[PDB]
Enzyme design. Sequence first.
Site, mmCIF file in Angstrom:
data_model
loop_
_atom_site.group_PDB
_atom_site.id
_atom_site.type_symbol
_atom_site.label_atom_id
_atom_site.label_comp_id
_atom_site.label_asym_id
_atom_site.label_seq_id
_atom_site.Cartn_x
_atom_site.Cartn_y
_atom_site.Cartn_z
ATOM 1 N N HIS B 138 0.836 -1.211 0.000
ATOM 2 C CA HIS B 138 0.000 0.000 0.000
ATOM 3 C C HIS B 138 0.870 1.260 0.000
ATOM 4 O O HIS B 138 0.390 2.355 -0.312
ATOM 5 C CB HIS B 138 -0.990 -0.028 1.195
HETATM 6 C C1 LIG Z 1 -0.721 -5.067 -12.670
HETATM 7 C C2 LIG Z 1 -0.566 -4.935 -11.157
HETATM 8 C C3 LIG Z 1 -1.841 -4.467 -10.478
HETATM 9 C C4 LIG Z 1 -1.814 -4.586 -8.954
HETATM 10 C C5 LIG Z 1 -3.223 -4.471 -8.384
HETATM 11 C C6 LIG Z 1 -3.285 -4.943 -6.939
HETATM 12 C C7 LIG Z 1 -4.696 -5.010 -6.362
HETATM 13 C C8 LIG Z 1 -5.376 -3.675 -6.107
HETATM 14 C C9 LIG Z 1 -5.787 -3.487 -4.638
HETATM 15 C C10 LIG Z 1 -7.156 -4.058 -4.234
HETATM 16 C C11 LIG Z 1 -7.488 -3.837 -2.741
HETATM 17 C C12 LIG Z 1 -7.475 -2.346 -2.360
HETATM 18 C C13 LIG Z 1 -7.916 -2.013 -0.933
HETATM 19 C C14 LIG Z 1 -8.160 -0.518 -0.763
HETATM 20 O O1 LIG Z 1 -7.319 0.350 -1.067
HETATM 21 O O2 LIG Z 1 -9.251 -0.093 -0.309
#
Ligand SMILES: CCCCCCCCCCCCCC(=O)O
Lengths: 390, 390
Positions: B138
């Site tokens: 994050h």
């Molecule tokens: C091509 C690489 C893409 C990487 C994406 C990773 C997943 C995205 C995050 C999903 C969860 C987010 C939680 C949040 O911020 O509220």
Amino acid sequence: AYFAGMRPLHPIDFIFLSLEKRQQPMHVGGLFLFQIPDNAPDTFIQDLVNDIRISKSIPVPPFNNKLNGLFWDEDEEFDLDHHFRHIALPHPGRIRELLIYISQEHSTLLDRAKPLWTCNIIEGIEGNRFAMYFKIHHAMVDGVAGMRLIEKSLSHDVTEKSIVPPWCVESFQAPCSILNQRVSSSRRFAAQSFDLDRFRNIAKSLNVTINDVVLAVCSGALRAYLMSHNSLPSKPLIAMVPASIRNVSNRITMILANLATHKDDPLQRLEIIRRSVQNSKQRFKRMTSDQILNYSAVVYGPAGLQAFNLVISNVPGPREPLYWNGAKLDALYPASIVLDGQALNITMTSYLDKLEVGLIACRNALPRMQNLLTHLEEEIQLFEGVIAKQ
Amino acid sequence: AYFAGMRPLHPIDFIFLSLEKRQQPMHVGGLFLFQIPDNAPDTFIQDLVNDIRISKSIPVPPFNNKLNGLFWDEDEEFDLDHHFRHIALPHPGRIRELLIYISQEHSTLLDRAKPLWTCNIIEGIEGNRFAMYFKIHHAMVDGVAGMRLIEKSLSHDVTEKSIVPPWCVESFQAPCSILNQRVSSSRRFAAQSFDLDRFRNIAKSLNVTINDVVLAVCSGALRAYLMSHNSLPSKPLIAMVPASIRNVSNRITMILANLATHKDDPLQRLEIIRRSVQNSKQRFKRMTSDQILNYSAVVYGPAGLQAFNLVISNVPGPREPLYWNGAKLDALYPASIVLDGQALNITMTSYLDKLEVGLIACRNALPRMQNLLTHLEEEIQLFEGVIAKQ
Ligand SMILES: CCCCCCCCCCCCCC(=O)O
Ligand SMILES: CCCCCCCCCCCCCC(=O)O
């Protein structure tokens, strides 16, 4: 709002809390020397402290602020005996023993369960003086913000009598060296006042700035000290230094400069330093939050391969005297932060046409660090000697 | 510049690094389900991974960024076998065992000596599918920024053939509850797709928003789950929830709301929730860095006496299908962050008129948490039942 009245921490605040560890407390401090008034009773201190002990006044911000998660909350139960100490130096109260006491006190962490400050009143200082040592976390103030607090809490009027306690008022060129070593928590503080007009006279004679002269005096002193411990690196020390000695609600721009400690001639050292300060391309303004944030990252969380060997800081003080219940502030010394890889910090404050020097070091990395006060004086005399011949 | 090419960490980045501990990793993740192309050879996966293993292409930012003090530096020696894993689910490759595998993987910390991401390719999923699990800190992206990376790295054109690896492309009202407990590092991930048109039909019939219905479905499901473990608090759960389900380069405003889990009627729960969302005064915009910073402090470093029992997050996904070398992205599930005092996180993504639900919990605080997927379905059916009678 945020929890009805609370304030989120500023990113700058959060840096100094997150980087604090056992071996490197992240508080700053000021050593105040006060002259007891000429017409004061022999109970001046006893009465001033007694007024404090019985006061019903509450600390005002920032002194009533305390941590609550990532937020500043209000302290609803001021605990005087947590924040406040009144002690005496045993007779005859020499400055040597005062600095031993401050060295010990500057070593200890602030408790995060309460507002992040403490106040020491030390009576019995030689020469009819008493001292205040005020410790405050850098998460609350840097030097410039601290000076503004000092000016708000003390008086410019020698006749004004205090009615409340002060807190209720209103790319990698730096060599390896023994300075750049993991640190312990134990500190050595060495402080001394110098007449700023001596630096002014040298600057005028050699057609340079006072800042140029101060930095060259520091360079020669550091070279002598390191040589005395057979620890002078072959390459010159690099330092983060001010661009000026006084600069309007302003923090002085800081510069990465060559201290030229590998040269054996004071005029040569001065010449290299002046050019480096003028021509350096690593210049860090400190006028905006973002600028201060980025400076703080460079200095307290530098990237590595180090970039500099030490920081020489300047915290401007007032030009007019301050008073506490009629007692004149005779001297004001800054005590800053050492950390892993930076075992020595030099900070200076201008006050009443004096240069107030505050040296703070890891006790175990830099033995006999207090000798630097002698080396500083000897370097001033050296420049004065070469001008006297010219 | 900063060390010739480096970039200071943003304050937001620094929050997520400073708060990470053994028991609470601060990475997020996406579980991608891909349909093998209809005309693909039986070696489609073997060949795609082989092209990865032999590629000479270098990661592009942010995938080539690594920590260096308080700065982002460039990774000069990409280590594929640190960042990349190709494994297979044993026959018959049921979704149950896929989620067990992802639960285990989402539990492990990212090594800060390298760029803060890993990529898993899992072949052999039932129904002619393969999965990608992409873990990313994050400190680098939140959900919305992650979605933008997904859209940049994958294609909207089913005919386009991939020539490089993806990473080379281009005030305290909340009761005590078992949700609010110190956490372990071990995770349980439970994911399921729902047809968004079912929520749309309910919203139209009862003259509310889709967001209203989704939150009421979550409330009834949480009430049923807690009751099944004799752990339903007397007071209603409070949650940080979205103001909308899709909101333009925008993060949805988040609201402190009453989930009304102490009421036994679904229409009653829905009514209280809708009013609370409309009328709540604790509203946190996320349009500016400062706003996002302050939201992050509320959620990940809340002050205490807690303020809320859980966060229900919404991460909008694309409205048009994505493809990898012709393989259609069939489903996309988010996996977010649990931490001390917040043992359950619910995050949802809209994709292709589906509601993609990602439940992540401390394995030891919430036993049998996967039952919530059944409770969610049963709550949708309950609303559908009451509308069918009306
Ligand atoms: C091509 C690489 C893409 C990487 C994406 C990773 C997943 C995205 C995050 C999903 C969860 C987010 C939680 C949040 O911020 O509220
Ligand atoms: C009335 C309370 C005033 C508190 C003043 C504390 C001392 C000021 C800090 C001096 C050292 C600053 C170091 C720096 O920021 O460069």
